[PDB]
C-alpha cells in the first residue's frame, strides 16, 4: 500500500569555468629590395649577298 514520492530531491552542483588567453606578435620589414633580373646585351647581323 506504500506509494513513492512524485520525484527525488537531487543535489545541486555549481560550476565555475575560467578561460584565459594572451596573444602577442611582431612584424618587421626592413632593407632595400633591388631588381634581380635585367636585360642583357644584344647583337644582330644582316646582309644581302645577291
Amino acid at each position: 500500500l506504500a506509494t513513492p514520492s512524485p520525484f527525488d530531491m537531487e543535489k545541486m552542483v555549481w560550476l565555475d569555468v575560467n578561460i584565459l588567453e594572451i596573444r602577442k606578435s611582431v612584424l618587421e620589414n626592413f632593407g632595400v629590395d633591388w631588381s634581380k633580373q635585367i636585360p642583357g646585351p644584344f647583337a644582330a647581323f644582316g646582309k644581302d649577298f645577291v
Binding site: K36, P39, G40, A43, A44, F45, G46
Partner: protein
C-alpha cells in the same frame, strides 16, 4: 635574292633567397579512464558542400 637576317638576345640573373621557419605546439589535456576529451585551438572556415 640571297642573304640572312638574324640576331640574339640575353637576360641576366643574380637572384638569391633564404628562408627559415620555426614552430612548437604544446597542448595539454585531461581525461578520465574510459572517457574522451577533445580540444581545438584555431578557427573555422566556410566550405560549400551540398548533395
Amino acid at each position: 635574292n640571297f642573304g640572312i637576317i638574324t640576331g640574339v638576345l640575353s637576360t641576366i640573373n643574380f637572384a638569391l633567397s633564404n628562408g627559415d621557419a620555426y614552430l612548437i605546439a604544446n597542448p595539454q589535456l585531461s581525461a578520465r579512464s574510459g572517457g574522451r576529451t577533445d580540444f581545438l585551438a584555431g578557427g573555422q572556415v566556410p566550405i560549400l558542400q551540398a548533395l
